[model samples]
Target: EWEALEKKLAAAESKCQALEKKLQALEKKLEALEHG
Candidate 1:
C-alpha cells in the first residue's frame, strides 16, 4: 500500500513538466505574433 501511494505521484510529475513545456511553447508563439 505504501509503495503504491508513493508511486501515485509519479504520473503527476510527468504531466507537470509537459505543462511547463506547453507554457514555454506559447511564449514562443506569442513572440511570432508580436513580430507581425
Candidate 2:
C-alpha cells in the first residue's frame, strides 16, 4: 500500500498547456491586429 503519488507534474504541466493555448490565441489575435 505504498502508492504515495504526490500529483506533482499534473499541476505544472497543465498550466503549461494552458499557457500554450493562450499564446496561440494571442498570436492569432495579433496577426489580425497587424492586418488591421
Candidate 3:
C-alpha cells in the first residue's frame, strides 16, 4: 500500500497548494479593507 499512500500524499499536496493560494488572496483582501 505504499503506492496508494504516495498517491494520497500527492493529492494532499495539490489540495494544500490550492488552499494556500486561496488563503493568501483572502488575507490580502482583508488587509486592504483594514487599511482603507
Candidate 4:
C-alpha cells in the first residue's frame, strides 16, 4: 500500500514539474515582451 501511494505521488509530481517548466518559459517570454 505504501509503495502504491508513492507511485501515485511520483506521477502527480511529475505532471506538476512539467507544468511548472512550461509556466516558467511562458513567464520569461511575457516578461521580455513587457520590459524589453
Candidate 1 Cα misplacement greater than 4 A, ranges: none
Worst 10 residues of 2 by lDDT: 1-10
Candidate 4 lDDT by residue in tens digits, 1-36: 999999999999999999999999999999999999
Give the number of the best model, judged by TM-score.
Answer: 3
Backbone clashes, each candidate: 0, 0, 0, 0
Each model's lDDT comes to: 0.92, 0.83, 1.00, 1.00
Candidate 1 per-residue C-alpha lDDT over 1-36 given as tens digits, one digit per residue, 9 for 90 to 100 = 988877878878888999999999999999999998
To one decimal, what is the Cα RMSD in angstroms of model 4 from the true structure? 1.4
Instruction: Judge candidate 2 at residue 18 and give its lDDT.
Output: 99
Candidate 2 per-residue lDDT over residues 1-36, each given as its tens digit: 233344556677889999999999999999999999
> TM-score of each candidate?
0.67, 0.70, 0.85, 0.70
Residue pairs that clash (backbone atoms under 3 angstroms), model 1: none
Tens-digit lDDT string for candidate 3 (1-36): 999999999999999999999999999999999999
| lDDT preference between candidates 1 and 2, better one | 1
Ranking by lDDT: 3, 4, 1, 2
State the displacement of the C-alpha of residue 14, model 2, in Å, after optimal TM-score superposition.
0.4
Poorest 10 consecutive residues of model 3 by lDDT? 1-10
